[PDB]
Every structure is written in C-alpha cells, then in structure tokens.
Amino acid sequence: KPTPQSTFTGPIVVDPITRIEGHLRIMVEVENGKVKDAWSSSQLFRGLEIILKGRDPRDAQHFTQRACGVCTYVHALASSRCVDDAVKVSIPANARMMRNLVMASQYLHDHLVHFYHLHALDWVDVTAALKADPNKAAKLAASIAPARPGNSAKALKAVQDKLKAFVESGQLGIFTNAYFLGGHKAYYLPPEVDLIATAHYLEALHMQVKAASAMAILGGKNPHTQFTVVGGCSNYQGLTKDPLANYLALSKEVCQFVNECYIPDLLAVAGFYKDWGGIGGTSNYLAFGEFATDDSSPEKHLATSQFPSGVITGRDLGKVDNVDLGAIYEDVKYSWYAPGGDGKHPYDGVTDPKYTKLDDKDHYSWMKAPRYKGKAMEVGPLARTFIAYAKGQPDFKKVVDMVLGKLSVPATALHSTLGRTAARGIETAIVCANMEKWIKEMADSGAKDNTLCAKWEMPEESKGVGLADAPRGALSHWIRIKGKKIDNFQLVVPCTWNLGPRGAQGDKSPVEEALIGTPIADPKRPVEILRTVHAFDPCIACGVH
Amino acid sequence: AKHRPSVVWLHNAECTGCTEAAIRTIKPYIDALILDTISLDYQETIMAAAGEAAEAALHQALEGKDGYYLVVEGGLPTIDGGQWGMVAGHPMIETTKKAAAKAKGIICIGTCSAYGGVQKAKPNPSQAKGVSEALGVKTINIPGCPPNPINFVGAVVHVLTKGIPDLDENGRPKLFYGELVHDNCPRLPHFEASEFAPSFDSEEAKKGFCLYELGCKGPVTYNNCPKVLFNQVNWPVQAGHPCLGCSEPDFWDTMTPFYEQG
Ligand code: SF4
Ligand code: SF4
Ligand code: FCO
Ligand code: F3S
Ligand SMILES: [Ca+2]
Numbered sequence: 001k002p003t004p005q006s007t008f009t010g011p012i013v014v015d016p017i018t019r020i021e022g023h024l025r026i027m028v029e030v031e032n033g034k035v036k037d038a039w040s041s042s043q044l045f046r047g048l049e050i051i052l053k054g055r056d057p058r059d060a061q062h063f064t065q066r067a068c069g070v071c072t073y074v075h076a077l078a079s080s081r082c083v084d085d086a087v088k089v090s091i092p093a094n095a096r097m098m099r100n101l102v103m104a105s106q107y108l109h110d111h112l113v114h115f116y117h118l119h120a121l122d123w124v125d126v127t128a129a130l131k132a133d134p135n136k137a138a139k140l141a142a143s144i145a146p147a148r149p150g151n152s153a154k155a156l157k158a159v160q161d162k163l164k165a166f167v168e169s170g171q172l173g174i175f176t177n178a179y180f181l182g183g184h185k186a187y188y189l190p191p192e193v194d195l196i197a198t199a200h201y202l203e204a205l206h207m208q209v210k211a212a213s214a215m216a217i218l219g220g221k222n223p224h225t226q227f228t229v230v231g232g233c234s235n236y237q238g239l240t241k242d243p244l245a246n247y248l249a250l251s252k253e254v255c256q257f258v259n260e261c262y263i264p265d266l267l268a269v270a271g272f273y274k275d276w277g278g279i280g281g282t283s284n285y286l287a288f289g290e291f292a293t294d295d296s297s298p299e300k301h302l303a304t305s306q307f308p309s310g311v312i313t314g315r316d317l318g319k320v321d322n323v324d325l326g327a328i329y330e331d332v333k334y335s336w337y338a339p340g341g342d343g344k345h346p347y348d349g350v351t352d353p354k355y356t357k358l359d360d361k362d363h364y365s366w367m368k369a370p371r372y373k374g375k376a377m378e379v380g381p382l383a384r385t386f387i388a389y390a391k392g393q394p395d396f397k398k399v400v401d402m403v404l405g406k407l408s409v410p411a412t413a414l415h416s417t418l419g420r421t422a423a424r425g426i427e428t429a430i431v432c433a434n435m436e437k438w439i440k441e442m443a444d445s446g447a448k449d450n451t452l453c454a455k456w457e458m459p460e461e462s463k464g465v466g467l468a469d470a471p472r473g474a475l476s477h478w479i480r481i482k483g484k485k486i487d488n489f490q491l492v493v494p495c496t497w498n499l500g501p502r503g504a505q506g507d508k509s510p511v512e513e514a515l516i517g518t519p520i521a522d523p524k525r526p527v528e529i530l531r532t533v534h535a536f537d538p539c540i541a542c543g544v545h
Numbered sequence: 546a547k548h549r550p551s552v553v554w555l556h557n558a559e560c561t562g563c564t565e566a567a568i569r570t571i572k573p574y575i576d577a578l579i580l581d582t583i584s585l586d587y588q589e590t591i592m593a594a595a596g597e598a599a600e601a602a603l604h605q606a607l608e609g610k611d612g613y614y615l616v617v618e619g620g621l622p623t624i625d626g627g628q629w630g631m632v633a634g635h636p637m638i639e640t641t642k643k644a645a646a647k648a649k650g651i652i653c654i655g656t657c658s659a660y661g662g663v664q665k666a667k668p669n670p671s672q673a674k675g676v677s678e679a680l681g682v683k684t685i686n687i688p689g690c691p692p693n694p695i696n697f698v699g700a701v702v703h704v705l706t707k708g709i710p711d712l713d714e715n716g717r718p719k720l721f722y723g724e725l726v727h728d729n730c731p732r733l734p735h736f737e738a739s740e741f742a743p744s745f746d747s748e749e750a751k752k753g754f755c756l757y758e759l760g761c762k763g764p765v766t767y768n769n770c771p772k773v774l775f776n777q778v779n780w781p782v783q784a785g786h787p788c789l790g791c792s793e794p795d796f797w798d799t800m801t802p803f804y805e806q807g
C-alpha cells in the first residue's frame with residue numbers, strides 16, 4: 001500500500017454497471033481522487049404492482065416471482081406468505097420446512113454465483129493468471145486452502161493452458177476491455193492467486209448447476225420454482241426418501257465447494273485488500289430474519305427466525321431493536337413517480353410512473369426510497385451478520401470471530417465494503433452447516449405424516465404481509481384484498497432499501513452513502529466504484545419491479 | 546486457432562431468469578460453450594468491462610468483420626420514446642434496432658423477448674412489446690419463463706452448424722415445442738379416467754391425480770418439460786403443481802387465473 005488514488009477532479013458516470021442483475025447507472029462527483037457525491041440511478045421500469053391490480057390473489061406469486069430470476073423463488077415465497085397471512089391460514093409444519101429448505105438452497109446458489117461470477121473480476125486480474133508458475137501456485141494454494149485435486153499443479157496448469165489458448169485467439173469475449181487489461185494500480189493480487197481464483201471461477205460454473213439441481217428437487221425447477229400454493233406446498237414427492245437422499249448428497253457437494261474454495265478465496269482476497277475495511281461503510285441495519293421455527297404469522301417469523309430479525313441504528317451493537325412493520329414507508333421525491341407520493345406505508349402504496357429526463361438531480365431513479373422512521377437502512381448479509389452477532393447467535397459468533405482473527409481486524413472493520421463481501425461468505429458457510437439437520441428434520445417428519453397444505457377460505461376483504469430475508473436482505477410483500485380480488489399489492493425489496501435514491505429529506509441511500517470517500521486510482525477505469533456497488537449484490541429488476 | 550462465431554446478447558425489459566436458465570446447460574456446460582464453441586462478445590450479467598468500456602465492447606462486436614448473431618432477453622418498453630428502459634443513456638429499443646440490423650440471425654430467449662412477457666400483461670404501463678413486433682422481423686423464439694437450457698443451447702448450436710431449425714406458427718423450433726406438455730404427462734391416465742384432485746390438501750392430490758381441475762394448462766401448452774425435465778431432476782407437475790402455460794404467447798393474460806379453467 002497505500003491505497004492507490006489519483007488527483008482526479010470531475011464527474012464519473014458508469015452506465016451500464018455490468019455484473020449485476022438489471023439496469024443501473026451510477027453517477028459520482030470526484031474531487032482530488034475521492035468520491036465526494038453519488039447518485040444511484042435505476043434505468044428500467046416494468047410495473048408489476050400496477051399489473052397485479054384487480055387479479056386473483058392466488059395468481060400474485062406467479063407474477064411477482066418474475067420481479068427477478070437471479071433471486072428466483074424468494075418473491076413467490078414472500079407472496080405466498082403474504083396471501084397466507086391475508087386469508088389467515090397457518091401452513092403445515094412440513095410446508096414451513098420445505099419452504100425454508102428451498103430458501104437455504106437459494107442462498108447457496110446465489111452467493112456462490114455472486115462471489116465468483118459477478119464480484120471476483122473486480123479483485124482478480126484474469127490475464128495476470130497467465131504469468132503465474134503453476135508449481136508455485138500449487139504450493140501457495142496448499143498454504144491458503146484445504147488440500148484438493150483441483151488445486152494441484154497439474155489442474156492449475158490445465159486452467160492456465162485453457163486461458164492462454166483463449167487469450168491468444170484474440171477473441172477475448174467477456175474479458176474484452178476489462179479494467180485490468182495491461183495491469184491496474186488497484187489490482188493487488190500476485191499472479192498465483194489470480195490463477196487459483198480463475199480455476200475456481202470455472203469450477204463454480206459447474207458447481208452452480210448442482211446447487212440449482214438440489215433446489216429443483218423441492219422446487220420443481222430452477223429458475224422460477226413451482227411448488228408453493230396458498231396454505232403450504234404441492235410437492236408431496238419432495239417429502240419422500242429417495243428425493244431427499246439426492247437433495248442431501250448434492251447439497252453436501254455444493255457445501256464442500258463452499259468450504260474448500262469460496263471461503264478460502266474470500267479470505268485470501270480479504271487479506272490482500274485489508275484497506276477495503278476502511279472504505280464503503282454505512283450505519284443502520286435491518287433484517288426480517290429467515291429460517292424460522294414458527295411461520296404461523298409474520299409476528300412469529302420475526303420472533304423465531306434462526307437468522308434473527310432486528311434493527312441496528314448508528315452502528316450500536318448494544319441495542320438491537322425489534323422490527324416495527326408499521327414504521328416502514330417509501331418516498332418518491334427523488335424518484336420517477338408523480339408528486340404527492342411521499343411517506344406511504346406499503347399497505348397504502350402508490351405506483352404512479354412519471355419520467356423526467358436522464359440525470360435530473362430532482363428525479364433520477366425508477367426505485368422508490370424506503371425509509372424507517374426517517375432513516376435509510378442497509379439490508380442483506382452484512383445486516384443479518386451484525387444483528388446475529390450482536391444477539392450472540394452462536395454460529396455467527398463463531399464464524400465472525402474466525403474471520404476477524406484470520407484478518408486480525410476488530411469487528412468495526414466489518415462496517416465496510418470488505419465486511420459486506422465477507423458477510424456474504426460467512427452466512428453461506430453457516431447455511432451449509434445447518435443443511436443436514438434441516439433435511440433430517442423434514443425427512444423424519446414427512447415419513448410420519450405428509451400433510452403439506454392446509455385448508456383455507458378467501459375473504460371478501462382483508463390485508464396481509466409476507467416477510468422473507470432473501471439473499472440480498474429484507475423482502476416484504478403487502479396485499480389489500482377487496483371483493484376477493486387484489487385491491488393493492490406492493491413489493492418493498494432489499495435492493496430498494498440499499499440502492500434506491502435519496503428519501504424526502506434529501507438523505508442518501510446506503511449505496512450512495514457507501515460510495516462517499518471511494519478512492520479512484522484511475523478515473524478511466526474506476527474499478528473501486530464497481531467494488532462497493534457489487535458488494536451490495538445489486539438487482540435492479542428486484543429494486544424497481 | 547480457429548475463429549469462433551460472435552454472439553451479442555442484449556438485456557432489455559427482463560428478470561435475468563433466462564440468463565440464469567442458459568447457464569444451467571450441461572451439454573455442453575457454459576464454460577465449454579464460450580471457450581470452445583462461440584465467442585460471447587457482449588453479455589451484461591457476466592462481462593468484465595462496465596460503463597463506456599462495456600459500450601465500446603458492444604461497438605467492437607457490432608462492427609466485427611466476421612459478423613455476429615444476436616440473442617435478445619426481455620421485451621422492449623416503448624412508452625415516452627423508449628425512455629423507461631435505457632442502457633448507457635440510450636433507449637433499449639434503439640440499441641436493439643441497431644444490433645438487429647446487421648445480425649446474421651436473432652434468437653429470442655424467453656417469453657418476454659419472444660412475445661412481450663410479464664411487463665406487457667394488462668394494463669401494460671410501459672407499452673412493452675416482443676422483439677418481432679418492435680423490430681418488424683421474424684425471430685427464432687425460445688419461449689418459456691424461462692425456457693429449458695436444452696432448448697436454447699440446442700437452438701444456438703443448430704443455428705451455427707445446420708441453419709434455421711423448422712419453426713411453428715409462433716416462431717418456436719418444432720424440435721422442442723412440437724408437442725403438448727399434456728400429451729407427455731405421466732398423469733394422463735388420471736385425466737382420461739376423470740380422476741382430478743379437487744384441492745392441494747386432498748387425498749387425490751397425495752395420490753398424484755390430474756391437476757386439470759386446479760387449473761393445469763398442459764392441454765394447451767407446447768413445451769417438452771415432462772420429456773426432458775429441468776435441472777435433470779424435476780418438472781412442475783411432478784412437483785404437484787399445475788402448468789401455467791408459460792411458453793405460450795401472452796400467457797399472463799390468456800392462462801389466468803392460474804388455478805382455474807375459467
Ligand atoms: S421470459 Fe420469464 S424468465 Fe425470461 S426474462 Fe422474461 S420474466 Fe424473466
Ligand atoms: S396434470 Fe396437467 S398436463 Fe398432466 S394430465 Fe392433468 S391436465 Fe394434463
Ligand atoms: N435477494 C434478492 Fe432480490 C433483491 N433485492 C429479492 O427479493
Ligand atoms: S409452466 Fe412452463 S416450464 Fe413447462 S410445465 Fe408448464 S410450460
Ligand atoms: Ca414497490
């Protein structure tokens with residue numbers, strides 16, 4: 001070190017932000033090589049909430065699932081929980097277990113793909129992998145990760161030979177114009193680490209097929225699962241012995257990769273970029289919790305989630321507050337919606353599109369701005385991690401302390417872009433550690449009694465909320481039913497919390513705040529913008545819907 | 546080293562479920578396809594370049610001496626001169642028009658690009674359109690929400706090595722979309738015997754009775770789902786749930802309510 005940083009003063013625009021879901025434009029003002037102001041500008045509107053009005057409430061989960069195909073399943077789950085609450089049905093134990101296991105499978109697939117296929121190219125110079133000696137890289141791999149055939153000299157040379165033939169063809173494909181071509185001051189990894197990470201990148205393309213096949217045993221298919229119904233689930237076959245044996249076996253292979261490659265790569269990258277523990281922090285954290293033992297009501301979900309719910313404000317780990325679903329609202333002042341729409345709780349949500357022009361500082365995003373008693377909230381792995389750690393959740397206490405010790409940093413260093421990236425791995429490891437217990441619970445239960453859907457009745461008028469903590473954080477769906485039809489259906493989505501624009505007070509969202517202070521080593525190739533933005537795991541189709 | 550055919554992949558009004566589906570391919574796996582078979586030259590989900598460097602990669606691909614095929618994911622929002630869906634400051638419709646102009650061939654991956662999809666469903670606030678309609682050209686449609694990778698990769702490889710596969714009246718390759726879901730359904734004997742589950746909690750449901758009475762659209766849906774499965778393990782009806790008709794044009798409005806035949 002020190003952290004490289006130019007003298008650049010002036011604007012930077014990055015559009016498209018690639019390696020995310022959906023269409024994001026980031027605009028920053030830079031002064032003397034650090035970002036001094038930022039704007040998160042979501043560039044597509046579809047309008048699922050408008051589309052849903054007047055439709056059968058049973059249909060909502062099938063429309064809302066298509067808010068996003070990266071976080072497939074999560075919206076179908078949130079809609080089903082939502083309608084379940086509105087008709088006041090408590091799902092059978094087996095449906096709670098099956099819905100929660102499908103969420104677990106979704107965490108593993110999503111987090112593996114994000115780290116390798118979306119985030120890693122911000123930290124890993126693939127073309128520098130060509131400079132590495134494979135025997136030296138194999139020795140190094142022995143010193144940073146579990147022993148495995150895939151990290152042998154022979155295996156790493158084969159990867160290097162494949163990459164060499166590809167680069168030498170002159171058709172660079174997805175690496176065309178990469179920020180790391182020619183070297184880059186902000187890229188710190190030795191060529192040996194580049195080679196090791198690239199080898200795992202390719203293995204992960206295969207491993208994610210297995211993670212999705214696991215999810216589909218219970219889900220029916222991936223992407224876009226088709227096993228949830230009002231009152232529980234449809235998938236009786238999902239409770240039987242052979243499908244569960246295959247589900248376990250596949251989940252053990254995926255988890256072996258998580259422990260052998262993902263966590264070791266993450267920690268190796270974290271070790272080299274320790275300065276990134278001082279960049280990109282925010283102050284307030286929210287989670288609805290996930291993996292509950294009682295999903296009979298949203299109240300019970302919040303209370304019994306094994307990854308707990310909570311609200312942390314101004315980094316005070318000493319005061320985890322309970323979630324007040326009544327205190328959530330959304331603003332539209334800096335958004336491309338009609339005026340008069342600020343401060344709306346989602347039961348009274350309004351979605352009235354009104355575009356102005358590109359880069360209008362008064363209206364610059366298709367995302368609404370969710371706020372909580374006037375404050376912006378960061379959601380996602382980092383939020384869940386701090387909340388669980390603060391609450392002494394033992395799996396989180398252990399895995400967090402392992403990471404802090406390996407990196408020799410205090411817990412405060414997690415309030416950062418490095419911490420946000422580390423929290424994603426931390427929770428993946430913890431989900432893995434729970435899979436066999438959760439699968440046994442459902443197998444034994446389903447063996448004894450295969451009840452999977454409860455009876456229910458459509459009310460003439462009602463409302464309900466469905467909560468989930470999706471891979472990206474706190475997800476909530478809200479319905480008003482009238483004449484047995486959808487009167488209102490509002491989605492408030494994790495990326496809406498993290499990446500939306502300013503709220504009615506002019507206050508920056510979490511990603512806008514996190515971008516403040518970002519050093520820019522090379523304005524022509526502003527990878528540091530990408531590092532922080534990607535650490536939030538953006539999904540603009542989710543954010544805007 | 547031999548040239549690999551250039552593929553340009555555009556994302557419009559989409560959920561990225563079609564990109565996710567494509568990478569679930571196993572014959573071949575996605576890495577083999579892009580290292581050995583095609584040159585994937587623009588793809589926003591996975592490409593290394595961002596911003597102006599990404600836009601230049603696109604430019605270089607569209608200007609390539611050897612020409613390129615186009616894959617489009619998502620429909621086109623057309624209200625307010627195309628401005629509700631933009632990339633790099635340009636309306637999606639405008640960029641898709643530019644790319645399609647010189648394309649050797651156009652493959653629409655998913656029901657959105659093929660037919661307009663979820664954003665086109667009533668009341669269609671973005672005035673979203675399928676590609677063929679937005680551009681006024683015939684497209685190779687690989688619909689489904691999302692389609693099976695088998696069908697998409699199968700079509701890509703066919704187009705590169707054998708020409709345009711035989712298409713039905715809605716642009717779908719007969720290889721994959723020639724047969725009704727229902728005609729290959731293991732619950733067919735129940736349907737023939739009028740043995741229908743009346744609800745998801747019923748003994749009939751537990752016994753695997755036909756899901757027609759719970760809204761199954763398999764009898765009007767062309768797709769290969771029961772035959773090839775998803776993820777080598779399963780399909781919706783095997784998991785106890787009716788077919789939504791998700792490979793059919795405008796299914797969001799023609800196949801709803803999903804849990805009824807009304
Ligand atoms: S066809 Fe379905 S899966 Fe594909 S982009 Fe459209 S909504 Fe998403
Ligand atoms: S479950 Fe659907 S596809 Fe199968 S026989 Fe019955 S109606 Fe046909
Ligand atoms: N995870 C995820 Fe997608 C977002 N934001 C949802 O919900
Ligand atoms: S919903 Fe779609 S994925 Fe196949 S089973 Fe029916 S066509
Ligand atoms: Ca919303």
Ligand code: NI
Binds near residue numbers: 021069071539540542
């Ligand atoms: Ni998403």
